Amino acid sequence: GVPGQVDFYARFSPSPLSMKQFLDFGSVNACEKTSFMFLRQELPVRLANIMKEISLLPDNLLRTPSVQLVQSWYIQSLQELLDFKDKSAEDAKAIYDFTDTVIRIRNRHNDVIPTMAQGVIEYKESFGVDPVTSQNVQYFLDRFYMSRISIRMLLNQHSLLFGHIGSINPNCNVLEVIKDGYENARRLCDLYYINSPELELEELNAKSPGQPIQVVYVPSHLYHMVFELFKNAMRATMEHHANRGVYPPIQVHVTLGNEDLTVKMSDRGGGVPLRKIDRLFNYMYSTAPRPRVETSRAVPLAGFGYGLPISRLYAQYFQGDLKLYSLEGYGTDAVIYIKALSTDSIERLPVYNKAAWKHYNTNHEADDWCVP
Amino acid sequence: GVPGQVDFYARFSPSPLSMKQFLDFGSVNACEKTSFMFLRQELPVRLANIMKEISLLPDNLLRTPSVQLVQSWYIQSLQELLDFKDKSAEDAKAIYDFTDTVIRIRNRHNDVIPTMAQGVIEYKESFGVDPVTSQNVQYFLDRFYMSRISIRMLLNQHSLLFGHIGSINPNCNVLEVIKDGYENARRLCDLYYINSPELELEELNAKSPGQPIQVVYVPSHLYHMVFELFKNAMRATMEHHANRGVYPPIQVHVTLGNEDLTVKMSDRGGGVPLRKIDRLFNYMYSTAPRPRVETSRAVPLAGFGYGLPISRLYAQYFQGDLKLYSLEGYGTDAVIYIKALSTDSIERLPVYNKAAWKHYNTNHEADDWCVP
Ligand SMILES: CNc1cc(F)cc2c1[nH]c1ncc(C(=O)NCc3cncnc3)cc12
Ligand SMILES: CNc1cc(F)cc2c1[nH]c1ncc(C(=O)NCc3cncnc3)cc12
Ligand SMILES: [K+]
Ligand SMILES: [K+]
């Protein structure tokens, strides 16, 4: 029945699109029939591939009310999409009903990321950290959230085009997005610490010096990354210098190279030893019950969610990256790497196959080197 | 015969030592009998483990005159060590003959690193890059050179103690080593580019502010790392700014934290795109015929050897690291991480076993993600 439908579409691989393909589609032609033909196969494929991995979760995580709800959302969206498998692209009502279904699914899935995060909280609350499964949880959540980002991208594009090119800005003003992230992080910082660091912004357009720095990008993806990084930099700065009462600025250097757009953000917030860096990207370590609604107390800036690992997934989604390197006792740099060329910006998508299944059913240990 | 001896000792795992163990040994007791008992087993074990992996090299690399010579050196040293397997620690002549043999082996192996590098040159000259084997060559050379570093360490300690604690300085003055590396790199830089960048050095002893920064370390290991990094930073700076004729300084920030000693080196040498960073640590990409003897022309600063990957192996040998991160179009940071505590500084050693053998006989590809 439903397992048969999931198995049929999970056999296929997701088909990654480049940023240029996204852009070229909705610019001139903007054919709703073309989007239909692509999505009536691609959305089921992407839903079914990730649904096979939901089923491999540790039972105590799978059985949580929040994961069960997310899975039921995916099952329902998949079934609604499969009703168009045999309908005709020339059937105008079918096209109309499909665009309507895309919008319905988009709203149904609006809360997937925090609901999944709620399931990890429920799991951690009632069973604790399990070192065997916890490697599988980290593997799953990277892939589930990257998958969700890609599905969200497809739904948003179709919804905006048929309900700036979709959510893509062909001329994203990088420094304006950065200032926007700074000001919103600073507002939260003032509310919590009653003070905040200044911003020092430097830019270099090596490609065309003195010219504004723009790229083809999804602005909300860039906003999410820099906003989350600013909150982490500010938290570290405010807590490390609380005794002094003088707070060093946060420095940002933006560079457009022949190939890389890089955003480097630097703080003097006291740093982190190298041994402790990676837990900042670990979902289980970052999982804590969420701030309560019934209080006027300010919300903490960082350490209370998945802002950082999800930021890195945004960077990696279009073949970029997000790296942290810290000098313990001094401060920390974060570097966002983005492809400067739209033709290099290709979706990075997980695929369910024997290799993926093997990851859930194997111990991963470096037995060819001596134990440290 | 000889294959039987190698197989017997390659069954064992190398036994890593901490920096504290190295230091505690040669400080007070300094028992030559104790060193004998340890080394008459540990040296054969470490030689035989790496010799099994020499035999797995691509035939066209194994058969080069330089690799054949290195292998014959290892075979001869192994056989000379095995003559003590049944001799008594109380036999004073046996102790004396063993210390004599350690010194002989140390000198015989003085040229292992450049001779192995000569074999890669010979291999690359006559057969080209082979994409299937080239992954195995990278895997082997990391392990062979890390193994050599560890064997060199044991030979040096025994030779210095029984021929400052050996080559270990319990009070290594980090900034003095750094200035030494700077001045020697600057000398080579002036010879090639007829100019050179200045040094700007900053230090922070977060552990004990204003106090000199010292750690237990092998000074020549630290020298090698910073000297190689300076040469790379200077090369990039001199070539990127050759048009301007004004050369920005190289900035170094040294920090001693509760856990990490970090050395950050920064240049404004124009940077490297992220896609091209890793080839800087790739032996096959870095392999070029060496500068000829018969010339007065200055030797190029970087790009002509294995200084950089071997520097990172030095850092990782005692559980540190060496990382590069660049902003394409602007410049590059290198960060050395060293354990601030001698008890955390444990040898990182390769071990020959089924896992190691499997690496040479498998294709390594990320089939659980879509091809970029
Ligand atoms: C650009 N800045 C930036 C970006 C970012 F994504 C994360 C951080 C960051 N700056 C940070 N400073 C400190 C921490 C931290 O983990 N602090 C806890 C810690 C410290 N010392 C010993 N044990 C634990 C994290 C960040
Ligand atoms: C601390 N500085 C530092 C340390 C280090 F270990 C290595 C480097 C370095 N600075 C560098 N700058 C440039 C390069 C390079 O690979 N240049 C070639 C390149 C550039 N642009 C496009 N394609 C290729 C390498 C380094
Ligand atoms: K599949
Ligand atoms: K072994």
Swiss-Prot record, chains A, B:
Alphabetic keyword roster: ATP-binding, Kinase, Mitochondrion, Nucleotide-binding, Phosphoprotein, Transferase, Transit peptide
Post-translational modification Phosphotyrosine, affected residues: 96, 192-193
GO CC, one annotated term: mitochondrion
UniProt induction comment: Up-regulated via the HIF1A signaling pathway in response to hypoxia.
UniProt cross-references to InterPro entries, sorted A to Z: AK/P_DHK_N_sf, BCDHK/PDK_N, BCKD/PDK, HATPase_C_sf, His_kinase_dom
Pfam families per the UniProt record, alphabetical: BCDHK_Adom3, HATPase_c
Domain spans labelled Histidine kinase: 123-342
N6-succinyllysine: modified positions: 354
PTM note: Phosphorylated by constitutively activated ABL1, FGFR1, FLT3 and JAK2 (in vitro), and this may also occur in cancer cells that express constitutively activated ABL1, FGFR1, FLT3 and JAK2. Phosphorylation at Tyr-192 and Tyr-193 strongly increases kinase activity, while phosphorylation at Tyr-96 has a lesser effect. Phosphorylated under hypoxic conditions at Thr-287 by phosphoglycerate kinase PGK1 which has an activating effect.
Molecular function, one GO term: protein kinase activity
Signal peptide: none
Tissues where this protein is expressed: Expressed predominantly in the heart. Detected at lower levels in liver, skeletal muscle and pancreas.
Other facts noted in the record for this chain: Exposure of cancer cells to severe hypoxia induces translocation of AKT to the mitochondrion, leading to AKT-mediated phosphorylation of PDK1 at Thr-295 which supports tumor cell survival and proliferation during hypoxia.
Protein name as annotated: [Pyruvate dehydrogenase (acetyl-transferring)] kinase isozyme 1, mitochondrial
Annotated organism of origin: Homo sapiens (Human)
